[PDB]
Amino acid sequence: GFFDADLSYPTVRTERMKHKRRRLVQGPNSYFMDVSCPRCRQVTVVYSHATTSVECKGCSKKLCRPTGGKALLVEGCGYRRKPDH
């Protein structure tokens, strides 16, 4: 015998695999990160799926490159995920 799935309270494994708009309550997949510029040496908050040109205030160097999904951070920079809330 095993646990039957409950529609109102799904398991972690079942919920984690679902599309963001197919979850029981829809929500974002993205987040924000603190990025230290390899040339300006300064902290800038960068969207995880940034599509526009994000540049460091000091060096004026691009901190990321847009892709089809998540933005790609330039080599050398250090990033830290900020809390969702």
Binding site: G1, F2, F3, D4
Partner: protein, 88 residues
């Protein structure tokens, strides 16, 4: 107290069919795929004392291959099977 009753209080039903313990579905006289399973009760020792618990499963569930899942749910509900292993 089950079945159709008269104004005089007399039961007029020819008979009362069984109800599936998984889907609350009436088991018809022509099913021939519905089964009745008796599970022996066990006392403090590993020996069965005198009694059994009976499960009725409709034939449609067995044809769909969900009888095993239903029996698992019923036995867990009745306290026969343990839903998970104990803590290490």
């Amino acid at each position: 107290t089950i079945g159709m009753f008269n104004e005089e209080g007399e039961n007029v039903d020819l008979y009362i069919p069984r109800k599936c313990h998984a889907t609350t579905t009436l088991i018809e006289a022509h099913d021939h795929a519905a089964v009745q399973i008796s599970i022996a009760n066990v006392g403090p020792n590993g020996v069965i004392n005198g009694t059994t618990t009976t499960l009725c499963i409709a034939g449609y569930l067995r044809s769909q291959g969900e009888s095993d899942h239903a029996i698992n749910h019923i036995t867990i509900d009745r306290g026969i099977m343990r839903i998970k292993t104990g803590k290490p």
